[PDB]
Amino acid sequence: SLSDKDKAAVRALWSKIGKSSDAIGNDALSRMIVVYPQTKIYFSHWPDVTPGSPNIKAHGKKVMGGIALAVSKIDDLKTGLMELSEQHAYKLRVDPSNFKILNHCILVVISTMFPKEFTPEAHVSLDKFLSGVALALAERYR
Amino acid sequence: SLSDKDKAAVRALWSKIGKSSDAIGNDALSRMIVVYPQTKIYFSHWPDVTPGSPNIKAHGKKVMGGIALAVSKIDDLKTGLMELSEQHAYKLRVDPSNFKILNHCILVVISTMFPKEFTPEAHVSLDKFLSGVALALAERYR
Amino acid sequence: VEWTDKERSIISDIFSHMDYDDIGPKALSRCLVVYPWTQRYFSGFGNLYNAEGIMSNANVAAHGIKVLHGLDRGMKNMDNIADAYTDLSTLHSEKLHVDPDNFKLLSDCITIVLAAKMGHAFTAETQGAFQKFLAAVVSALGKQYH
Amino acid sequence: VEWTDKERSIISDIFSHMDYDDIGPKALSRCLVVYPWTQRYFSGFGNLYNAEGIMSNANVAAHGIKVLHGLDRGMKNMDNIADAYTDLSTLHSEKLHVDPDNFKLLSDCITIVLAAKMGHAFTAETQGAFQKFLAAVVSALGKQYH
Ligand code: HEM
Numbered sequence: 001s002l003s004d005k006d007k008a009a010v011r012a013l014w015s016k017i018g019k020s021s022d023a024i025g026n027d028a029l030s031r032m033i034v035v036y037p038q039t040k041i042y043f044s045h046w047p048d049v050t051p052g053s054p055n056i057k058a059h060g061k062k063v064m065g066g067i068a069l070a071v072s073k074i075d076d077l078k079t080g081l082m083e084l085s086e087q088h089a090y091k092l093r094v095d096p097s098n099f100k101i102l103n104h105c106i107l108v109v110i111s112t113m114f115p116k117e118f119t120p121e122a123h124v125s126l127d128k129f130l131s132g133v134a135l136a137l138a139e140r141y142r
Numbered sequence: 143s144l145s146d147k148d149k150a151a152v153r154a155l156w157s158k159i160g161k162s163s164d165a166i167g168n169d170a171l172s173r174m175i176v177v178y179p180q181t182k183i184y185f186s187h188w189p190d191v192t193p194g195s196p197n198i199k200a201h202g203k204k205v206m207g208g209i210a211l212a213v214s215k216i217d218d219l220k221t222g223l224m225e226l227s228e229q230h231a232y233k234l235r236v237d238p239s240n241f242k243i244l245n246h247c248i249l250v251v252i253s254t255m256f257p258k259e260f261t262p263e264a265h266v267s268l269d270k271f272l273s274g275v276a277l278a279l280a281e282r283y284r
Numbered sequence: 285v286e287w288t289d290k291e292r293s294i295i296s297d298i299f300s301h302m303d304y305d306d307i308g309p310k311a312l313s314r315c316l317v318v319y320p321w322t323q324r325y326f327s328g329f330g331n332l333y334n335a336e337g338i339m340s341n342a343n344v345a346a347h348g349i350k351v352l353h354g355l356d357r358g359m360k361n362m363d364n365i366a367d368a369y370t371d372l373s374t375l376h377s378e379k380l381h382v383d384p385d386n387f388k389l390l391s392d393c394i395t396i397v398l399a400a401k402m403g404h405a406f407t408a409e410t411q412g413a414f415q416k417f418l419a420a421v422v423s424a425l426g427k428q429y430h
Numbered sequence: 431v432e433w434t435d436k437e438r439s440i441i442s443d444i445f446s447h448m449d450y451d452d453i454g455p456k457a458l459s460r461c462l463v464v465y466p467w468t469q470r471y472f473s474g475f476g477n478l479y480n481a482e483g484i485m486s487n488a489n490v491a492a493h494g495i496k497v498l499h500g501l502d503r504g505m506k507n508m509d510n511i512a513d514a515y516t517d518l519s520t521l522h523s524e525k526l527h528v529d530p531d532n533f534k535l536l537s538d539c540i541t542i543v544l545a546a547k548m549g550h551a552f553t554a555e556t557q558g559a560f561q562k563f564l565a566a567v568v569s570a571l572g573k574q575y576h
């Protein structure tokens with residue numbers, strides 16, 4: 001679980017980089033789909049499943065909107081993300097194993113974009129956080 | 143997280159198989175070490191790291207004692223397993239990635255020993271439970 | 285992956301004694317209950333689960349028999365696993381859009397259902413060779429995912 | 431794993447521009463902080479972390495340089511990755527007793543530290559070829575685990 005140290009760490013980072021959440025999400029989704037092309041099956045209903053395609057760019061804003069909401073609900077992610085979980089679980093049926101793949105891509109993007117901010121210490125707490133995010137998103141699956 | 147359905151499912155199964163916890167643990171540890179020999183590094187201080195060796199048999203009782211304790215603390219595993227977590231995290235420094243490997247071996251043993259009891263429904267709740275166990279055991283690691 | 289003779293014997297031995305008409309259906313039925321998102325690929329068959337929540341559709345379940353016969357091929361020529369499964373890989377990826385992670389989940393179900401049937405004959409070393417075989421097929425099935 | 435020419439160029443290009451004396455130490459230092467159980471293998475060097483909690487031991491950190499030079503070998507002959515790392519695999523397993531999962535964790539750290547340095551030149555396709563290479567080395571390092 002996240003310590004008070006972790007939460008502060010994640011709120012302070014987000015406080016600094018949230019301004020770029022649209023680009024972080026565009027970039028993170030593009031990476032997932034290119035580096036882990038098997039995940040494109042969940043997006044195959046889009047006409048352009050290419051990096052920075054208008055569908056990818058748009059959805060990128062939603063994902064990082066969900067990540068902004070997870071920071072906001074960081075003290076109780078299960079409750080906070082319950083609706084997003086139900087979405088991914090019963091409407092979309094996304095294998096929860098994929099959450100850690102996007103999470104890894106989010107870490108890669110943030111490092112490329114905010115190298116001086118994304119310190120070992122920021123990294124360990126964000127990692128723990130993204131892991132809690134995946135766990136809450138898995139809530140409604142079984 | 144575990145539903146009231148999951149908890150009942152796990153307490154009823156354990157109620158039925160706990161009598162064999164010593165053999166289940168002996169067998170589960172033996173399987174891990176044979177099927178996943180890289181885990182033997184954490185046990186290399188024992189003179190006999192072989193299936194059903196006296197060290198393996200003895201430790202098997204402790205592991206399943208920890209699993210009996212997790213059933214007993216099923217409503218708050220984080221708190222319940224906190225001491226076991228600290229043990230594995232700071233004293234032994236076991237990569238938490240290994241917890242799901244032993245968990246898989248526990249499921250295999252239970253199936254071999256209690257085939258009619260270990261139904262799809264028992265399996266899904268025990269799986270969720272063992273997953274919560276691993277998560278609580280990871281508590282003190284970072 | 286290379287194979288020792290003992291592993292080859294173990295795998296051959298497992299499949300010769302395996303009742304595919306039993307193991308197969310049980311394993312897919314179990315995976316649809318333990319990893320429920322997998323029902324996404326069968327959803328169109330309809331009438332999948334019990335009021336009681338069990339995946340009782342024999343038809344869908346019967347796909348587990350085809351999986352096990354799909355395993356025959358790797359088993360028949362274990363030195364050619366990777367090339368053995370290209371058309372199957374192509375099919376699950378390009379036509380079925382199946383998440384490859386689901387291959388791992390079903391394998392796990394197969395191992396446990398097999399475990400229940402063989403009982404104390406499913407030794408640690410048996411589980412070992414059988415997991416190693418499943419792993420190699422899984423990997424080969426995710427190759428045509430592009 | 432087979433390699434396209436584009437992947438070969440990408441990996442060669444990454445290593446030619448890489449400052450091992452910078453990347454290497456940062457990546458191991460980061461992994462000891464993000465995956466703290468890895469300090470178990472260096473614990474005997476002593477004086478590992480800062481009051482402030484940073485892994486400031488340059489000596490230990492300098493092992494990250496040896497890792498990166500360990501990567502040179504796979505990079506030099508990408509068609510021979512699996513055989514390329516047998517003595518290294520033997521060493522981390524039989525003498526160092528290193529959990530192989532830790533190879534994955536360090537790789538991830540390497541990728542992110544590299545990511546920070548290359549910035550927008552670390553494209554999706556670059557990350558792709560570089561991850562694929564790391565994966566292949568990782569696998570080869572866990573081969574002598576028996
Ligand atoms: C960090 C983890 C993730 C977050 C925060 C997240 C967030 C979101 C949000 C906010 C939506 C929109 C919900 C709505 O339509 O009301 C969404 C939809 C979606 N997500 Fe995720 N997601 C995550 C991971 C994933 C992963 C790993 C996949 C699959 C690889 C995935 C697949 C999808 C799909 C297919 C949709 C619907 C697209 C459409 O409507 O066309 N998500 N996600």
Ligand code: HEM
Nearest residue numbers: 181184185204205207208209229234236240241244245275
């Ligand atoms: C289901 C998950 C697990 C449970 C419930 C569990 C339980 C236990 C218990 C109750 C102890 C004794 C604590 C003490 O000495 O006071 C123990 C010790 C130990 N555990 Fe675990 N364990 C689990 C997973 C693992 C895994 C996956 C590994 C490594 C592969 C591991 C490695 C060890 C070691 C090396 C010891 C100490 C042995 C000794 O004292 O010689 N454990 N475990």
Ligand code: HEM
Nearest residue numbers: 322325326347350351354355372380382386387390422425
């Ligand atoms: C990893 C082991 C697997 C093997 C060896 C395998 C093998 C097969 C084979 C042999 C077929 C029939 C192709 C034909 O008609 O010639 C098939 C079809 C199919 N497979 Fe699998 N499969 C595997 C796993 C999965 C998984 C995990 C899923 C989804 C959760 C899946 C979904 C399907 C579907 C939806 C069909 C179409 C059959 C129909 O519509 O009647 N398979 N597979």
Ligand code: HEM
Nearest residue numbers: 468471472493496497500501518526528532533536568571
């Ligand atoms: C996966 C990528 C890795 C590569 C390519 C690699 C490579 C190397 C090399 C080249 C050496 C020096 C051998 C010599 O002296 O000839 C070494 C030593 C060592 N490695 Fe790694 N390594 C890797 C990961 C790890 C990890 C993940 C750990 C533990 C967390 C680790 C722990 C050690 C230790 C403790 C030494 C001994 C060095 C000393 O005591 O000075 N290695 N490794």
